[PDB]
Design a protein around this ligand. Structure first.
Ligand SMILES: *[Se]c1ccccc1C(=O)N[C@]12C[C@H]3C[C@H](C[C@H](C3)C1)C2
Length: 283
């Protein structure tokens, strides 16, 4: 849990005009290019889950890369929502894509000397897909994206229902307020599987971790674990195969037999990809 004392970790308050509030960002300056470490479904407002559960700051200290951990955004999918969640009295609209792609990089450039371009987005659970979507639509910002136990085909089959159940359980957030009903174009727009051709066209460097066993942040009380595990396996296989079929050739896939959907394995992936990110971003 957390990193060793004495590191140059700063707790920053970054204004978001789109959300009408400051967003807390934990930051370790270490070079003009950065790794954006995105949190999972149950993201809290005190610390990013990467900091709470891993020594990520310590691991990337003196790596030649800055580390950016935005704080907050429970159940947000790091996306721009249509409107506030109508199930929990949310009193503003999540605009996390606007924050991550416009507001935050402008502020970090002016205040911390971080380049708005040539960075990596690394996500897990909820934010695995977010990382891939950010790279799909903002390739200059994110030539590198990692999805660790992400939801790779959120618009397909039972996934919109299962994601909705999880979002409601995680703070009472309503998926309808986010991307509309499952027939709405926003579901396909934000679906990594559907956006494979963008990832291929831009030659995004992708790193995908597939986990085994008990699901992370998925479905609800009614859903049998085995059913969910089977859906996850088949969706992951479909993503890897479709990426290849669509001409993708810049993706590193990871499926260790003992790997689970858990912080120790997500951290192992973060450690494993460090040299890769250094090479891609810094030469
Ligand atoms: Se990520 C995933 C999901 C479903 C099936 C297979 C995989 C996957 O990445 N498999 C491997 C197998 C071998 C060769 C490649 C690199 C390692 C080891 C994982 C692909």
């Amino acid at each position: 849990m957390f990193s060793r004392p004495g590191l140059p970790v700063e707790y920053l308050q970054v204004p978001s005009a789109s959300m009408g509030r400051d967003i807390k960002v934990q930051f370790q300056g270490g070079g003009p290019h950065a790794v954006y470490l995105l949190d999972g479904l149950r993201a809290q407002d005190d610390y990013n889950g990467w900091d709470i559960n891993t020594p990520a700051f310590e691991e990337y200290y003196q790596s030649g890369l800055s580390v950016i951990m935005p704080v907050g955004g429970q159940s947000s999918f790091y996306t721009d929502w249509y409107q506030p969640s109508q199930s929990n009295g949310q009193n503003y609209t999540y605009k996390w894509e606007t924050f991550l792609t416009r507001e935050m990089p402008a502020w970090l450039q002016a205040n911390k000397g971080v380049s708005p371009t040539g960075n990596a987005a690394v996500g897990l659970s909820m934010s695995g897909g977010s990382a891939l979507i950010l790279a799909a639509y903002y390739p200059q910002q994110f030539p590198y994206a990692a999805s660790l136990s992400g939801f790779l085909n959120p618009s397909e089959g039972w996934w919109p229902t299962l994601i909705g159940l999880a979002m409601n359980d995680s703070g009472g957030y309503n998926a309808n307020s986010m991307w509309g009903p499952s027939s709405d174009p926003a579901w396909k727009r934000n679906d990594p599987m559907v956006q494979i051709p963008r990832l291929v066209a831009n030659n995004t460097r992708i790193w995908v971790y597939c986990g085994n066993g008990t699901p992370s942040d998925l479905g609800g009380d009614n859903i049998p674990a085995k059913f969910l595990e089977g859906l996850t396996l088949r969706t992951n296989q479909t993503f890897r195969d479709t990426y290849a079929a669509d001409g993708g050739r810049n993706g590193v896939f990871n499926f260790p037999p003992n790997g689970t959907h858990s912080w120790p394995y997500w951290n192992e992936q973060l450690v494993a990809m460090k040299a890769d990110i250094q090479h891609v971003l810094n030469g």
